[PDB]
Amino acid sequence: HVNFRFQIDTQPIGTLSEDGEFSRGSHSLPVPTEYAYVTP
Amino acid sequence: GVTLMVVSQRPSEVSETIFSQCSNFISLRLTNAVDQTYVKSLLPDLSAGLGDLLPNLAQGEF
Lengths: 40, 62
Hints:
This is part of a larger assembly, with 2 copies of chain A. By secondary structure, chain A is mainly β. The first copy, chain A, is 0% helix and 15% strand. The first copy, chain A, has no helices and 2 strands. Chain A has strands at 14-16, 22-24. The first copy, chain A, has a two-stranded antiparallel ribbon with strand order 1-2. The N and C termini of chain A lie far apart (30 Å). In chain A, 0% of the residues are buried.
């Protein structure tokens, strides 16, 4: 608190496709201005 | 006229002498930290990034 600021660190594990697989290992890199979501 | 080929999965608990005489290295996925330290030390041309690459390799890569 200075408004508020919340930070969450993270470490990548996997890559989930749209078909629904789970290929371990992520050689990609996400760009900023991009969104996040909670695990249902 | 005879050569070796060593295979392991926990290289820390392996002989220091059997590796050092190895002229080529193939590194697949490794996660356990201490193993990263050891395999980074023994192997010369490895800065921080070449170690940051080991624990994110895919299945089938090397």
